[PDB]
């Protein structure tokens, strides 16, 4: 290992945000602090100096952005309330208003977060699990944090993945979330502006490890068209990918890369098939320097490859 890698919590929550190939990755250190590593032509940071706040040890870590102008990082307090670390260009980092609402969630809750797509407005949707094991949506629409739609029961401790996109023929954003139910299946719920939340769950994987990590992205929105990718840790101790492609639906799935038992997972993307992409980056723990965070890359030029073997501070 390295003194650097040893600072990274084993099975840390992982999140990532980007503006094309300008990357930020969030993780928890062994003292409970949330740190940011960065890629701006090369990897940097992830040190004691790149602390953006503190969270309960073992906390989920979620993040969403509007390019790198506005970044929001979500975690649990020691009291099992949702909290938020915020960055705005020109202001830097501060404690977001989410914590002030004191939303109490199950101590084992995960978190997902999206900015709503296709608007300049800063509108956020956060997904977590309440003590009754239901998935609750929380909303910011410019005038305080409020509860949104309750999305029903899920396996206690389920991973939660989420993405927002805007079809170019729609007048408003869509949302898709993924989670695990008590029967251990992985499922999708869906929100469109005309149907609201679709009544029924769509199964994307028949049986997954209990509380397996779940991470999702979408890209290349067009007229009533989208591409989506969902990742989770399967029982073979690897990340698997599930593929939605326009015109084919949920038509394929397969292993991507080995991880440590119980690794968490983050995904970012940019670009589209129509324009010499997309690009995909996955972050996870695969045992490099024991506890370092590693990267997997997909692009058009070279397809599937391992990227940075050990992210800063390793």
Ligand X SMILES: CC(=O)N[C@H]1[C@@H](O[C@H]2[C@@H](O)[C@@H](CO)O[C@@H](O)[C@@H]2O[C@@H]2O[C@@H](C)[C@@H](O)[C@@H](O)[C@@H]2O)O[C@H](CO)[C@H](O)[C@@H]1O
Ligand Y SMILES: CC(=O)N[C@H]1[C@@H](O[C@H]2[C@@H](O)[C@@H](CO)O[C@H](O)[C@@H]2O[C@@H]2O[C@@H](C)[C@@H](O)[C@@H](O)[C@@H]2O)O[C@H](CO)[C@H](O)[C@@H]1O
Site for ligand Y, rule CB under 6 A = 176, 188, 190, 198, 202, 224, 226, 229, 241, 243, 245, 248-249, 252, 278, 280, 298
Residue 35 in contact with ligand X, rule: CB under 6 A: no
Smallest gap from Cβ 82 to ligand X, in A, equals 10
What would the x/- binding string for ligand X be over residues 101 to 140, using CB under 6 A?
---------------------x-x---------------x
Q: 124 vs 128, which CB is nearer to ligand X?
A: 124
43 has binding-site annotation:
yes
Q: 10 vs 198, which CB is nearer to ligand Y?
A: 198
245 has binding-site annotation:
yes
For residue 120, the Cα-to-chain-centroid distance in whole angstroms is 21
Find out whether 14 and 266 touch, Cβ atoms under 8 Å. yes
Residues in the chain: 314
Distance CA 263, CA 174 (A): 29
147 has binding-site annotation:
no
* β partners of residue 128: 111, 136
Task: Tell which positions 245-304 bind ligand X, by CB under 6 A.
Answer: 281, 295, 297, 299, 302
Give the angle 70-76-81 at the CA atoms, nearest 5°: 105
Distances in Å between the alpha carbon of 190 and those of 148, 221, 231, 298? 14, 15, 17, 26
Distance CA 14, CA 294 (A): 11
Residue 181 in contact with ligand X, rule: CB under 6 A: no
Distance CA 184, CA 124 (A): 28
Q: 67 vs 245, which CB is nearer to ligand Y?
A: 245
Among 178, 180, 174, CA closest to 189? 178
Task: Indicate the residue whose CB is closest to ligand X.
Answer: 97
Give the number of other Cβ atoms within 10 Å of residue 197's Cβ.
17
Smallest gap from Cβ 275 to ligand Y, in A, equals 13
What is the three-class DSSP state of 12?
A: coil
229 has binding-site annotation:
yes
Instruction: Judge residue 302's burial from the number of C-beta atoms within 10 Å of its C-beta, 0-12 exposed, 13-18 middle, 19 or more buried.
Output: exposed
Residue 99 in contact with ligand X, rule: CB under 6 A: no
148 contact choice in ligand Y, ligand X, ligand FUC, none (CB below 5 to 8 Å, kind-dependent): ligand FUC
Distance CA 242, CA 225 (A): 17
Distance CA 138, CA 214 (A): 19
298 has binding-site annotation:
no
Q: Which residues bind ligand FUC (CB under 6 A)?
A: 125, 137, 139, 148-149, 191
Candidates 11, 32, 38, 108; binder of ligand X (CB under 6 A) is 38
For residue 102, the Cα-to-chain-centroid distance in whole angstroms is 22
Which residues define the annotated binding site for Zn(2+)? 243, 245, 251
Which residues define the annotated binding site for alpha-L-fucose? 24, 36, 43, 72, 84, 93, 97, 125, 137, 145, 149, 176, 188, 197, 229, 241, 281, 295
Contacts with ligand X, residue ranges (CB under 6 A): 21, 23-24, 36, 38-40, 44-45, 68, 72, 84, 86-87, 94, 96-98, 122, 124, 140, 281, 295, 297, 299, 302, 305, 307-308
């Amino acid at each position: 290992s390295t003194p650097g890698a040893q600072q990274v919590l084993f099975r840390t929550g992982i999140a990532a945000v980007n503006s094309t190939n300008h990357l930020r990755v969030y993780f928890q250190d062994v003292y409970g602090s949330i740190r940011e590593s960065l890629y701006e032509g090369s990897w940097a940071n992830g040190t004691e100096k790149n602390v953006i706040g503190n969270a309960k040890l073992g906390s989920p870590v979620a993040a969403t952005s509007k390019e790198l102008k506005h970044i929001r990082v979500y975690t649990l307090t020691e009291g099992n309330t949702l909290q938020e670390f915020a960055y705005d260009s020109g202001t830097g980092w501060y404690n977001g208003g989410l914590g002030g609402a004191k939303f109490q969630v199950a101590p084992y809750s995960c978190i997902a977060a999206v900015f709503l797509a296709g608007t300049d407005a800063l509108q956020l949707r956060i997904y977590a699990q309440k003590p009754d094991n239901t998935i609750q949506e929380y909303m910011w629409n410019g005038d305080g944090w409020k509860e949104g739609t309750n999305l029903g029961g899920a396996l206690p401790g389920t991973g939660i993945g989420a993405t927002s996109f805007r079809y170019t023929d729609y007048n408003g954003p869509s949302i898709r979330i993924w989670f695990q139910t008590d029967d251990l299946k992985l499922v999708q719920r869906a929100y469109d502006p005309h149907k609201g939340w679709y009544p029924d769950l769509v199964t994307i994987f028949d049986r997954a490890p209990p509380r397996t990590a779940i991470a999702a992205t979408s890209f290349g929105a067009g007229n009533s068209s989208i591409y989506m990718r969902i990742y989770f840790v399967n029982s073979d101790n690897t990340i698997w990918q599930v593929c939605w492609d326009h015109g084919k639906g949920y038509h394929d799935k397969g292993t991507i890369t080995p991880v440590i038992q119980g690794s968490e997972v983050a995904i970012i993307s940019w670009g589209s098939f129509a324009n010499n992409g997309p690009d995909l980056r996955l972050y996870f723990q695969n045992g490099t320097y024991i506890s370092a965070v590693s990267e997997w890359v997909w692009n058009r030029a070279h397809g599937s490859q391992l990227g940075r073997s050990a992210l800063p501070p390793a």
